[PDB]
Ligand binder design. Structure first.
Ligand SMILES: CSCC/C(=[NH+]\C=C1\C(COP(=O)(O)O)=CNC(C)=C1[O-])C(=O)O
Ligand SMILES: CSCC/C(=[NH+]\C=C1\C(COP(=O)(O)O)=CNC(C)=C1[O-])C(=O)O
Ligand SMILES: CSCC/C(=[NH+]\C=C1\C(COP(=O)(O)O)=CNC(C)=C1[O-])C(=O)O
Ligand SMILES: *Cc1c(COP(=O)(O)O)cnc(C)c1O
Ligand SMILES: [Cs+]
Ligand SMILES: [Cs+]
Ligand SMILES: [Cs+]
Ligand SMILES: [K+]
Ligand SMILES: [K+]
Ligand SMILES: [K+]
Ligand SMILES: [K+]
Lengths: 456, 456, 456, 456
């Protein structure tokens, strides 16, 4: 089916208030037209992020009643360890409270100042931890990933020529590791093919270079391989996931994404010495090697959720629900990043509001308009989030000026997607009426989080 | 909007699954062709009943952690008592484990042998408890309620002329009480108007006759009043519910329906002497006046759920989701009871299976065939449910021979409704293949729950 | 050990509080001097009953998250059925919402008017359901069970000479069944020996008489057999339980006692025809044969809890905690029933209040005074609970006039027992101050639950 | 009363079990003679730590069902913020996943390399984060705190003469801050007086020096003030807590101790600029300022638990239960730190094992022997925990060489305390059998968590 029915039914609901437009207008004004400042209690459909916002199952909630809260050696850790060893195939696992805790550990362990880390684009926290430990980041994604309207498969793949070039100019010993993300968030949630993972593994192995995956959306990635990569159409999601990680030396994982939980993460590796070093550091920042900054019940929920994520029908519906939203927007002529990724639809606010300049913050204003008209919260991912250059005093000015519609797993229905699409499309039909915004309060940094605006 | 989105988010899920047709065939035969004897694990979408199958909210589950399990005087009872007094306006409440526990109490307290109980169409458990305590049941619903295809508003209303005739012929002193159900389950979930409730109060009061409501689906009923009865368009659900019960002397309630719970019921009354007598009897069959055969946590969940049911957007969506299923079926030519009711779509098995007579149990057989071909469980609501005449020994022969696609509250989506509709539409194309059934095992009362059949 | 430490630790708590004596004095008067009418919030330590007040385990709470709420054929029902078949050995099980629901079914199914039901001491609800269906109750417990100060083992045993005499004088065909309770609640929680169960099985089987066990405290009973009956010292609790029920034709069970739950019960039987008849009747009063007036989650919790109860260390501690309280009271000279039983310490109110006659309700008044002086709630188990003779209308006058300090399972500690003992010992020092009581409101049956009194 | 009963009842339980001594010996060897490396399932009574091992209440578990998992603006964050502002009085709060996450933030924000941080005794994670960010730690606790057997009140107080000397010798501008811990963990859980907090505030304020409290066991501290500091006898715990923090510029908190939770912490500060800088840094390591590496449900549970901790009867019982264990050990001749602290009994391994030198790690070996002989897990708090001197490379050599019997809140009973005491008393009778240890694996920091040893 183009759009399958949910492969689950509802066990329990999160109630919502359903406040009307006049009241949403006041809330948006009180939030200074910044959706990051809205109160959760005032939001009907919250698409700010797919991170930690997922609905758990009955089996996960049963596990939440079985937390072994011991400081060391919790049975829940051994359940998580066994599950990750089975499904990802790595020899060793260290729990962390979420993904950036694992990134902190990996970058401290595997980078020397001056070295390079090359990846298929970057994620904000991952690159910060690389750079804070002295690495220079090099983007080795295929050029195609940067073209928003290019509707091609496996747009997240690494350009092997860029990787060969880096090796030739800088030298293998000066490359700390390759950071291969699945899927690639900044490209719109675009997958990487098994062929590319295998090819990257072959080239790096010939030079002794390590490859660590950013595995946060690896199950969405596996679905794209099953659906679209020749030869994988009849492999199980689990078989695909296991093969993907066979081409890596380790990974960082945010369980808050594809492990179907509200908190949790981990670091995996095959190397024994790196495992020992990682355990010496986890106690500094997170907790013991057997809890990593998580309650026992959360290790249990993450173990159960990662296994639930292997169900084909679950991940097919997850990805096709996102696709449903993107397809409805595209059919109405709304410009989006293509093809639709695994976890989100991205609106091109620059083209949505061509009557405004980027200095008038069209993505921020479009996000405000979306909430007023529908009760849906979306994330600004444009000039505001890019920040300001404190040296020159001017904005960093991003290539992509977007509004991100990020879909939590198992929370919403197709009818909710219709609410989102209908409101965005109605606005698009009168896009000229969307007003530009100006700062009335701007902090020196983290400005997306607390900045306040008014209409021009 | 014809079909609004869910006015809630999913908080937790439960997986669904389908087994092959050949296995479904074997299971239906093992169940003696009675869907009530099928196992839950073998059902894909379970529409047997809206009773006790509802999804609770986060607030209800929080209450489930606050059970005061004391044998007497639980705080959860006082919460339930205060909530029901506020929302229904009755002086006194006695909890019961579900609705038929309240019916047992009412029928023992209020019936002397030989008296008449008059109601707007029978219900199975209700009529049995009336008859077993010596009453003769008299149907005083309007004739239109028995005409499946007649689309008129408030089909559940009592015909005041039938009520007056009963009074004239039998004498008011020989009427135990009037049983006024809202909505009327077996007419198709058909509502009763506020005008009719007021008229019934006025007429019975003039003779000193008591009126006890069956409140099991009273919130669905209040929605129809708000949607369709002149002068109520702007009144709140809670205001409508409170006025409804101001025309009654008490009620029986299965909380398992409109109180959004999985277990629970209660008996309400205004009269002090009847309350004292009800308390003397609740301890025989159920438990204390302050637990009534329920865990404390379940009184808490029922208190919270009844209040949640008062939210307009919740009940509007509940009813319109059922309407969506019926609309799709009717447009494809599948015969149904009209208008669609509050809790279920009722297939008209007489028209679906015109090649069978009612003595060949077309609704029972249709329910079986639906399961074999689709994995969807539905309920017989026809000659089998109607039972035997307790005087003549022949079958009761209701004009309505129907199969009920019964929708649990807050469990399924519109996509699930589409799956159900598509499968029934396909069965309809070969309706002539549905075979007649005959009894092989017939219980002595309430036979539909466990009877077994074989094909003719 | 005499008093082992708890074989569990605390997973979660509920706060308790003492209120001032002047407030307890007013509350006791407002409750008509009946502890059953006090509110839970006003009780410091609530020893009214061990029924439904137990603390569940983490594993049971995990099961509570796995409720299959289907109206028919829930997986939780099948888990309960498999568990009871394995542990008790009966062919068939019908769930009920609690014990008296099972008693209603058994008494309606198995009693013809005028027949005799013989049991090892009456119980309140049990006797009412026997008499309501037309039986004469005959006490066949050994005479010793009625003597509070007689410290002998297996005081609950049936006197075979009394059973033989009933058979000889009345005829076996006029005996509906034998009710064999394990333990015997109102004798003080006194166990029945395996030898006695065997002897009763042999005599009844020879005459075609059925024996239905009251299984409500069967695990406590098994502990006494393991501890004290020659030849069972090395048998497991589970082995003992399974052998006990091999001597029975079925059982009634309030799961609210030894199944470690807050709600639940069942009726078991080996006879297929009685099973069919019981299923035809359960739908009238309780629910389907596959839910019986319980939520699916509650069938799950009861299945888990009954298995947990088989753990030796759990039941040893359970019984020895009760013994600790009784030993401390006896050592201070407070008169109690001996030996101490499995679930409660029974104060001998005839001796505690020697200055009152039984017609002045000394047990009822002692329970009131305990609450006033200590904040501890306890239960009358004497003339009030015994009820009125259903032939003469005079009080039944049990030799045992007692107040029951009933201990919920896994709820309280030895320190709480010390508080209870200390308070009762202090009251004993001025026992002459306890005033006699008289009825001001008397229910027509089961009067102890809600009767109100005033001081003479 | 010396030893009050628990001011709560048990709501739910978790089983406990013991493996036999021969198996414990093998497990201890496999764990390299480090109790931190034992598995939870192999422990009978787990007194490794009071961190994150607490039993939550029914009200907290209700909150766990009300998690608002939104990435920003969660109701649970606002509840936590409001609660901490009310109870502690600080202007701003940043959540962290646990205490060392807050320490990471404070140390990075408030320390210029080379500056001094002065505290009332070191703590392991705290000192590591101070030193990693370039500070020199200076102990300014009163000398008596290092004297295990000296029973004096408020042993945790700062010696103002030592603080004045640091100011005079080093200059106020070279002191990053004072770290004032309540209670002082490694001194034995010893409290700080309000008078001392006031005097420290006055002296630091006169020199412009900031004071940040370690609030982890502040409620235990407040109890000691109420019980023993003149003038506080009739002040509530909450009033005491609020006054305590009025003398601070901010705090770090591990909620896993006195906030009665299994995960969670926070950083508070009054300074607006530090708050802005902390929000910029929390995103790097923990998460948004709106969740700080915690699920919404955990912010909710922490807010509820901190408020519950203010109940006098709860904290009185908490501290007196620890005192019960210490009193029993002391009376039997077992050497302990005196007076007993708020959260643990500290055995004095220097006196327990006088046949060993500190260089043979007597505390580490005593903890191993305790587990082997009793199944009780305890923590080394001596030379191993003290770590290496980061200037000389030699062991730090604390005067206090102790083993900590750390009591989780609301988990164990006095009967469990008796078991612990009896086993340690028995081991003391053959104390000469405890063998010295040597490192076989030493982590580079926080070595006590994962080091491995062998017998000399
Ligand atoms: C499968 S027939 C049993 C369940 C069921 N209805 C129950 C009702 C009861 C009895 O209430 P309860 O089941 O004892 O709580 C009383 N009045 C009405 C109007 C009812 O609809 C249904 O599927 O429609
Ligand atoms: C406050 S008197 C009611 C509670 C209670 N006992 C109940 C019993 C029942 C009825 O079971 P249920 O209460 O209907 O589940 C049957 N057999 C026995 C042996 C019982 O002890 C008690 O406090 O001792
Ligand atoms: C086993 S050593 C770790 C656990 C532990 N203490 C932790 C503390 C932290 C760190 O807090 P966190 O553990 O990161 O939440 C800060 N200040 C104090 C005073 C602490 O006692 C203990 O057992 O005593
Ligand atoms: C969200 C994210 C992370 C960081 O994980 P957290 O759990 O939020 O700390 C890292 N990489 C990618 C690709 C992410 O999307
Ligand atoms: Cs669709
Ligand atoms: Cs004891
Ligand atoms: Cs004690
Ligand atoms: K979250
Ligand atoms: K924990
Ligand atoms: K209960
Ligand atoms: K149910």
């Amino acid at each position: 089916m183009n759009y399958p029915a949910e492969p689950f039914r509802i066990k329990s609901v999160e109630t919502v208030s359903m406040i009307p437009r006049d009241e949403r207008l006041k809330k948006m004004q009180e939030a200074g037209y910044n959706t990051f400042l809205l109160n959760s209690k005032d939001i009907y459909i919250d698409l700010l992020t797919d991170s930690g916002t997922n609905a758990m199952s009955d089996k996960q909630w049963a596990g939440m009643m079985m937390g072994d809260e011991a400081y060391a050696g919790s049975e829940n850790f051994y359940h998580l360890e066994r599950t990750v060893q089975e499904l990802f195939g790595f020899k060793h696992i260290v729990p962390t409270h979420q993904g950036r805790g694992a990134e902190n550990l990996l970058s401290q362990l595997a980078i020397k100042p001056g070295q390079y880390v090359a990846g298929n684009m970057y994620f904000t926290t991952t690159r910060y931890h690389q750079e804070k430990n002295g690495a220079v980041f090099v983007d080795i994604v295929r050029d195609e990933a940067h073209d928003a309207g290019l509707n091609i498969a496996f747009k997240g793949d690494i350009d092997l020529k860029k990787l060969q070039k880096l090796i030739d100019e800088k030298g293998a010993e000066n490359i700390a590791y390759i950071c291969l993300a699945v899927t690639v968030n900044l490209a719109g949630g675009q997958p990487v093919s098994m062929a590319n993972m295998r090819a990257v593994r072959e080239l790096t192995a010939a030079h002794g270079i390590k490859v660590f995956y950013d595995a946060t959306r690896c199950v969405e990635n596996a679905y794209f391989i099953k659906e679209q990569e020749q030869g994988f159409e009849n492999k199980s999601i689990a078989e695909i996931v296991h093969e993907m990680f066979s081409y890596a030396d380790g990974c960082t994982m945010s369980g808050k994404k594809d492990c179907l939980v509200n908190i949790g993460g981990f670091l995996c590796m095959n190397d024994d010495e790196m495992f020992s070093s990682a355990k010496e550091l986890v106690v500094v920042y997170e907790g013991m090697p057997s809890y990593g900054g998580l309650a026992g019940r959360d290790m249990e929920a993450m173990a159960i959720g990662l296994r639930e994520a292997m169900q084909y029908e679950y991940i097919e519906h997850r990805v096709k629900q996102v696709r449903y939203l993107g397809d409805k927007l595209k059919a109405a002529g709304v410009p989006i990043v293509e093809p639709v990724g695994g976890h989100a639809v991205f609106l091109d606010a620059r083209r949505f509001c061509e009557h405004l300049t980027q200095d008038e913050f069209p993505a921020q204003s479009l996000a405000a308009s979306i909430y007023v008209e529908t009760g849906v919260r979306s994330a600004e991912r444009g000039i505001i989030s890019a920040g300001r250059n404190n040296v020159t005093g001017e904005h960093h000015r991003p290539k992509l000026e977007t509004v991100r519609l990020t879909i939590p797993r198992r929370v919403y229905t197709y009818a909710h997607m219709d609410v989102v699409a209908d409101g965005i499309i109605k606005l698009y039909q009168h896009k000229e009426d969307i007003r530009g915004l100006k700062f009335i309060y701007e902090p020196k940094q983290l400005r997306f989080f607390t900045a306040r605006f008014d209409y021009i």
